[PDB]
């Protein structure tokens, strides 16, 4: 649904 960008 929502993200704030990929971790690593």
């Amino acid at each position, epitope marked *: *649904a*929502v*993200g*704030i*960008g*990929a*971790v*690593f």
Partner: antibody
Amino acid sequence: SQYLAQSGSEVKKPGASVKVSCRLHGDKFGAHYIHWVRQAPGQGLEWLGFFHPGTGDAVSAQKFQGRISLTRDTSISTGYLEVRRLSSDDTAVYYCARDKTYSDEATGMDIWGQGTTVIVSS
Amino acid sequence: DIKLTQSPAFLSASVGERVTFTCRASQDIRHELVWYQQKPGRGPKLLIYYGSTLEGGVPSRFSGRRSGTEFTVTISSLQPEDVGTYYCQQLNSFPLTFGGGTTVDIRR
């Protein structure tokens, strides 16, 4: 153990600003998203925003947009919530919480800070 | 805002009784829904995510079910440590809204 340690209780006058701090212990600060949530006395939970602790990218709820800012300092693994132009409606316990962050998306807040009460009063 | 409607607002039952409460999303939120348990005097704690998945540490007595936009939790046998307020949250679209909560207590 992975825990979130927050700053202690605050008292602020109407119109002032507050800044709450949340420090992540026991893991990589950049591995998971981190949320801010607040609960006013006798009321339910309210989502404020969340952020990318590695990149600094953040999103705040439309209601609070322009009124709050979510930052972090990677050197110390610490997030910050600043709320400006305070009123009585901002009295609450403010929580930071780690998200499970599955599939590079909001998955659920699995680790909660103990919260910091912020009292807006004269 | 997607609105989450929880029912009932208050729920009372005896120890060992089976209980269910509901969270209803104003629109389709897929499986992106989560539950938190808040014990009295304490902070919220992660219970169920992806609508049906139990968090680690959470007893088998808990389960969750999705039917369309309707999400329910079932406690097979209620115990005193289950007492508190349960909140559902949608993770589907901004802002990520909370339900109004359902407060569970022990009936005597």
